[PDB]
């Protein structure tokens, strides 16, 4: 169940009792994500939003089927001070997802 913002936060995840990591660069995070999809940490991964928003390139790299490693953006410890994007983030979710832009 890997989660990648820092190794400093990841040892807090070990203090929670789940495996986590930290890379501080994009290809290193996708490579450790790649071996994590290869041999599982039971396939549920979150990556820091300032590190990788969409790691789905790794999904189409290794495991195009079953979408079992679910990939999540997550608010970092140096970023959770602001409350990242929530309403405009849903704006771009709708813009990405259905084609239309709405206001609601």
């Amino acid at each position: 169940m890997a989660v990648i913002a820092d190794p400093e936060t990841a040892q807090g995840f070990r203090l929670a009792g789940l495996e986590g990591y930290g890379a501080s660069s994009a290809e290193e995070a996708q490579s450790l994500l790649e071996t994590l999809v290869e041999r599982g940490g039971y396939a549920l991964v979150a990556v820091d939003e300032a590190l990788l928003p969409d790691p789905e390139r790794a999904v189409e790299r290794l495991m195009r089927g079953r979408d079992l490693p679910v990939l999540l953006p997550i608010a970092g410890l140096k970023e959770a001070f602001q409350g990242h994007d929530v309403e405009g983030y849903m704006r771009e979710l709708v813009r990405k997802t259905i084609g239309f832009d709405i206001k609601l």
Binding site: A46, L72, A75
Partner: protein, 112 residues
């Protein structure tokens, strides 16, 4: 997230980084999260929930006064994270199926 972040800030600022290292690495990695199946409109996604055993009371007089508090904060954090993950995969399935039905309606109309 802000709760667990402030809990770790207090538990490694008022305390030892070496002792949170020992308190983390003494705890095993705790595998055990599992999954079940949604079949709806034919489409099928697995949703997950975690076991997260609390039985590892490793010398249950916990030698710092704070990492039980921060550790349960991170356990609630991971519960909220797997909740957001299931919400995410449900919304992606609904979106791609609306994409399918939209190109199916447009194709069927304009072609046949």
């Amino acid at each position: 997230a802000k709760e667990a972040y402030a809990a770790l800030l207090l538990a490694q600022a008022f305390d030892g980084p070496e002792v949170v290292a020992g308190a983390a690495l003494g705890v095993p990695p705790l595998e055990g999260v599992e999954a079940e199946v949604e079949n709806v409109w034919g489409s099928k996604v697995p949703r997950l929930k975690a076991t997260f055993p609390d039985g590892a009371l490793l010398s249950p007089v916990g030698t710092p006064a704070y990492t039980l508090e921060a550790s349960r904060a991170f356990r609630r954090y991971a519960e909220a994270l797997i909740r957001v993950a299931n919400t995410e995969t449900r919304l992606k399935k609904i979106g791609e199926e609306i994409k399918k039905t939209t190109r199916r309606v447009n194709a069927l109309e304009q072609v046949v």
